[PDB]
Amino acid sequence: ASIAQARKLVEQLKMEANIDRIKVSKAAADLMAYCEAHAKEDPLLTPVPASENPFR
Amino acid sequence: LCAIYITYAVIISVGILGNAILIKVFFKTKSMQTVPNIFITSLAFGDLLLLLTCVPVDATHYGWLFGRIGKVLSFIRLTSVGVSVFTLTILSADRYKAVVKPLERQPSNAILKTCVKAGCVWIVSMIFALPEAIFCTSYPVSKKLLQEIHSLLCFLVFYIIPLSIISVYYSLIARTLYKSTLNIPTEEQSHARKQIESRKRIARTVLVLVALFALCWLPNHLLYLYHSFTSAMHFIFTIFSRVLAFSNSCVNPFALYWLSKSFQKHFKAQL
Amino acid sequence: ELDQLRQEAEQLKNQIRDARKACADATLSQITNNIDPVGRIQMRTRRTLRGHLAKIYAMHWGTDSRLLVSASQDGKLIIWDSYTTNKVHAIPLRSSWVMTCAYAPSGNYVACGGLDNICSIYNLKTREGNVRVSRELAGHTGYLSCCRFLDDNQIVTSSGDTTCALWDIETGQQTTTFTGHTGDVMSLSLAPDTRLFVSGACDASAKLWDVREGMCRQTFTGHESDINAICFFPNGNAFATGSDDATCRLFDLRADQELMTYSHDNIICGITSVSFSKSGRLLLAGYDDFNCNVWDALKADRAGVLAGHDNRVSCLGVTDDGMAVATGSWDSFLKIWN
Amino acid sequence: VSAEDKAAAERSKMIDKNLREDGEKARRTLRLLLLGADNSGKSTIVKGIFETKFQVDKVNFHMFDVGRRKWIQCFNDVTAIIFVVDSSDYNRLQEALNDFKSIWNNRWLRTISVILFLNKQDLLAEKVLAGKSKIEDYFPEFARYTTPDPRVTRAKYFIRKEFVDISTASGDGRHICYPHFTCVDTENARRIFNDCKDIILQMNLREYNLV
Structure with a gap:
């Protein structure tokens, strides 16, 4: 009954535990790298002139 | 003597202030912006025009100070009276439809329909103001039968049909509310008795509004008819008749203030 | 034995939390403190798509960025052309309680579901010019959310x-x-490479x-409450x-921990x-308070409000x-903002 | 514009006219949320979704039974909520009271009126006449309660008083509760019709600045 579900959850958390974890510093660093890489591809962030805007 | 003019001034100032506050509340607050409010603000505009046109005439009386073409004043007065009376009739019809036939709805995205109705009412009133384009009296002495027929036409068009429609529709509204006050859970108050009192109060206010329309608009047309048929101490009567004539449009927004509590809150907020 | 299983489960939870804390070097704001703030951003309603009767729960853009599908509680599934507001399609629904809708990346089919517990697929392109149900998917016990x-x-x-x-x-x-979620699953989102997906349920x-x-x-x-979107x-x-x-x-899979709070x-x-947004620098979010707020996903400071809806922004x-x-x-x- | 643009415009206009026809046909119906409880006779009240259609006085009603804290948001624009309780039993009557409290105090249903059907009143009469089970065992305030067979009326009015007392603890008149006694009875559709008509009349009064 509940023993099988307990075993399943324990196995799940065990395979969750042994995963490679990345330091949050370089995580934030590459988040900034990605957002600055696509900075000018974002018309919402940087509005484009209305000549090519299809939403006059 | 001069005491009668004090009542004139206070009544006209109260009416102008009431309609100004009503239009200010309607335009500032988007919460009360929908189909029923279009005709209410049309009535507010009509009363504002009627009072702003009633100011210069007794300002001048106390020949004529304005110009001959300054014709346009009588035209604007007649079209303001027309739009006020006809918008009263249209509001009466809308309230009858809302109260007596609630399941059969229609307002939702019909802003175009109500705007078209209001514009047609205003244009028809403007056209009815045209027959006065002859000529600050409206007609000369020679027009004996012509002034008679114009007086009868104006009296009937502006007082018989609209009063009949308003009285019938509003009496039906009051009867429907008095009958529907018995379809409420009754016992265990704070949710049922309040509805009883509200419906009874609405019916009484509606009946008082009809009676006040009739009483306030009767003397002006009565005096016009008597003058057309055929001034020693009648000037006080003329002044009182005019005050009673324009007091109805003054009291028109006071009924909305009296009934709606949300309108009361908005009125106090924008006061 | 249940007691020893619970003890080892709680000790492994403690050790995983300790490892998660140890992997944390510095907060997101500390690293993203020198970045130039995006500033106030203004968005105007370019188009207002009208035609739906009841409240609207979901919408989805097509890959072409021209067409989009919206679902309403009046049991109508309308495909719009946001460029010209023209309604390309209007698919009647068997169940008027639709809670979600989708647009296939190829653009050939759309899907919807709700309290009927069934995901219905409609074929947009037919030789006869009419849209019909291509397939009915059944098997879910609870109402469809996404x-x-x-x-x-x-x-x-x-x-x-x-x-x-799947x-x-x-x-x-x-x-x-x-399987594994404890409460109602409210939303999901496929990865850009179509290899993983994340699910936010009501179990917080x-x-x-x-x-x-x-x-x-x-x-x-x-x-600390139900997660409604993800x-x-x-x-x-x-x-x-x-x-x-x-x-x-914000959560980072590599860090396996919470990153930033937008409150x-x-x-x-x-x-x-x-x-x-396209670059990820801008995080838009709908709210129960009739308005849509715009968040700068790096600094957690608001940068705009998409006001203009006189009811709840549901999607x-x-x-x-x-x-x-x-x-x-x-x-x-529907309102198009640009 | 171009010919294909005109074709798109005409397709859109046919779709829009069909949409307006559908709206005119389907927004005259009143949506009802049958939200009673099990063993309360909720299903047999009118002679994952179970929608039923009935028409009274040339008006179309659409009742929806679901077979709760999350999908209840969908029924935000329903005309009224029909609640059915089993007044015969008293062990589960407190559960019905708690369910009514949670429904009344729900944020999404703070403007939706509730029609209350106290079902199975014949069994209530039989139980109260039998005397084997006493309401005071479950509601000690009944022993001190006096009505404003007499004991049947006392019991039913006491239960109705409890439900309406729960109802009036909040709301401030934004929505009211309509309690009804139901057996077997074939007049429940008329009761729902009248209550919905009163609710719509109140909505029109509110929206027309008359109250």
């Missing part, structure tokens, strides 16, 4: 029975079932799933959760929809090119 097309023949659906499933339109069978937790294998890769916590970062290594406690949070004292209502999406934002709402109105 569904996204992996491809022309695969779809992942989330239902209210605390489960997520289907096959050709055979109408559950290829893989994802989010889980990362892999479609190919079919097990919970990672579990994320931190919210979406992936454009790079695919992060996702944002919009929950009912009036807060939004304010004035806002007390929960999040209804969450989506990023919002950003085009693939990021050139428009459509926000459906409970007033039966």
